[PDB]
């Protein structure tokens, strides 16, 4: 039993997977088995969701997070996001679940049966962490794989049914994307936008053409980069900048994933384009705005002139100006005026909310949608009692946006922590003092006193 | 009788599963009968 | 709901998503079996 106790490996049971660092075969096993776990949860969770799915209830009333992902891709839904066929959901689930058996098979094999190290077995599959060439090569392979994936999204959107477009004219609907945005000024334009209010960085992408074009770009960039890293070896400045070891690479990737997790948190919290509110429920901004809309509609029906109605503070009760002058909803929701949504935009004119449009053009479907979203705001308790913290039990509801945002903030945080841990440790190990200070060569003892 | 006859890992596994079962039952009770709000 | 044909497997389906968690616990059963060496 090679390297399977503390005495031989140097690592205690609670750090047992650190025993895998230079055992490429077994490590391969661990990774493929884990991928199996991921695919397994995807499939199993999908089937669970589908079994619990009532098609005439909003998805977001039913604690669903995966079926919304499938539906956003255009599968299973029609106008307004109505479920017209559940079978694609079923397929996605079954196929992931079946595939996880294969992955788990390979993982268990490599982990407890196959060659424990791959280097003597295969120069192709074997690797030394310090071998910068090989590392950048494998990196290259996987970049090519990622590019291929992004291109699969593109292909779905352009040649295999399209995507669900919440902004589709005449109402949300599945639409084939035929003119993706290829202009780099726009695409990387998103990348250079402020992350702050009314800007939102890449989180602000608000049309499917930009999404698709972005994935075209990312696909080509990843394939090119992958080839590049297969064909080259790190330059000198890179060599001198980084730590070259398994734990170092792990630390780098942990940092990356922490960042991505934070980004995704914000994405699901603010964006209603790639996270359609039809499937995920309204965003926080959206529901607050919807309340303002709802009572403007009610009171105006009662005879109120909502344009001239002065609220208690002196600001408009229903309508006021943003700090740059646009007409926006009043009350606390003044904070959310950057919100944009298919149900509200028809009331928007060049200077913001249009009083004439508000007075004459509000449709019943808009009233409905505003009421729905106001009454499904992403607020709720840990035991899924919907509403403000003082609400009585009755409605079983926590928004999927809340579940996704909170989960991925937690995970992103702990992954930042993991990055600090493994980066600091990789530094110390590479320099050779990860196990402690050499008593006979204590560095501070050779330094001049501070005073 | 002699000690060590039953493997400590089996005892631990069984005990642990028992704990998961009873706690599981208590959480079930949060949704059914008294205290369910229903 | 699942297609009618598969409905008999509804209980099984209800239990599947939790299986990954079991693997974590399995790691500990296994370690206890080798005395956490």
């Amino acid at each position: 039993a090679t390297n399977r106790d503390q005495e031989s490996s140097g690592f205690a049971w609670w750090a047992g997977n650190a025993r895998l660092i230079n055992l490429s075969g077994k490590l391969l096993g661990a990774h493929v088995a884990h991928a199996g776990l991921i695919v397994f949860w995807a499939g199993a969770m999908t089937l669970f969701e589908l079994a619990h799915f009532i098609p005439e209830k909003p998805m977001y009333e039913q604690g669903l997070i995966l079926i919304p992902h499938i539906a956003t891709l255009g599968w299973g839904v029609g106008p307004g996001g109505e479920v017209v066929d559940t079978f694609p959901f079923f397929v996605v689930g079954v196929v992931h679940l079946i595939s996880s058996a294969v992955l788990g098979f390979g993982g268990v094999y490599h982990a407890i049966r196959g060659p424990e190290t791959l280097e003597e077995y295969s120069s192709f599959f074997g690797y030394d962490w310090k071998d910068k060439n090989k590392m950048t090569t494998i990196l290259g392979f996987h970049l090519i794989v990622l590019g291929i994936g992004a291109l699969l999204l593109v292909a779905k959107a352009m040649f295999f049914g399209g995507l669900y477009d919440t902004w589709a004219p005449g109402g949300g609907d599945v639409r084939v994307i035929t003119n993706p945005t290829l202009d780099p000024r726009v695409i990387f334009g998103y990348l250079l936008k402020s992350p702050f209010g009314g800007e939102g960085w890449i989180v602000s992408v608000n049309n499917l053409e930009d999404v698709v074009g972005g994935h075209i770009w990312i696909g080509l960039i990843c394939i090119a980069g992958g080839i590049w890293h297969i064909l080259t070896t790190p330059f000198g400045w890179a060599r001198r900048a980084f730590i070259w070891s398994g734990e170092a690479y792990l630390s780098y990737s942990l940092g990356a994933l922490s960042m991505m997790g934070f980004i995704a948190t914000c994405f699901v919290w603010f964006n209603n384009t790639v996270y359609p509110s039809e499937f995920y429920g309204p965003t926080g901004p959206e529901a607050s705005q919807a309340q303002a809309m709802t009572f403007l509609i009610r009171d105006q029906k009662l005879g109120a002139n909502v344009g001239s109605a002065q609220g208690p503070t002196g600001l408009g009760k229903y309508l006021m100006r943003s700090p740059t002058g646009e007409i926006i909803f009043g009350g606390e929701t003044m904070r959310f005026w950057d919100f944009r949504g298919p149900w509200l935009e028809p009331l928007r004119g060049p200077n913001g909310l249009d009083l004439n449009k508000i007075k004459n053009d509000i449709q019943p479907w808009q009233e409905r949608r505003a009421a729905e979203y106001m009454t499904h705001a992403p607020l709720g308790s840990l035991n899924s009692v919907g509403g403000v913290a003082t609400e009585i039990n009755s409605v079983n509801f926590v928004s999927p946006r809340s579940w996704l945002a909170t989960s991925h903030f937690v995970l992103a945080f702990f992954f930042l922590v993991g990055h600090l841990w493994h980066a600091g440790r990789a530094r110390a190990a590479a320099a050779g003092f990860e196990k402690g200070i050499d008593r006979e060569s204590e560095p501070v003892l050779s330094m001049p006193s501070l005073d | 009788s002699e000690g060590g006859r039953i493997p400590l890992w089996i005892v631990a596994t069984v005990a642990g599963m028992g704990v998961i079962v009873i706690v599981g039952l208590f959480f079930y009770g949060a949704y059914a009968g008294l205290g369910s709000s229903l | 709901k699942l297609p009618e044909a598969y409905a008999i497997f509804d209980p099984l389906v209800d239990v599947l998503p939790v299986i990954p968690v079991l693997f974590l616990a399995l790691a500990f059963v296994w370690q206890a079996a080798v005395g956490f060496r």
Partner: peptide
Amino acid sequence: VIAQLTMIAMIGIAGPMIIFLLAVRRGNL
């Protein structure tokens, strides 16, 4: 509601069962 508990009993034992079988057969744990 019986079948759910039966299933999770079969799966839930499936794990420890592997360990036990291997321990008995003095396998490569």
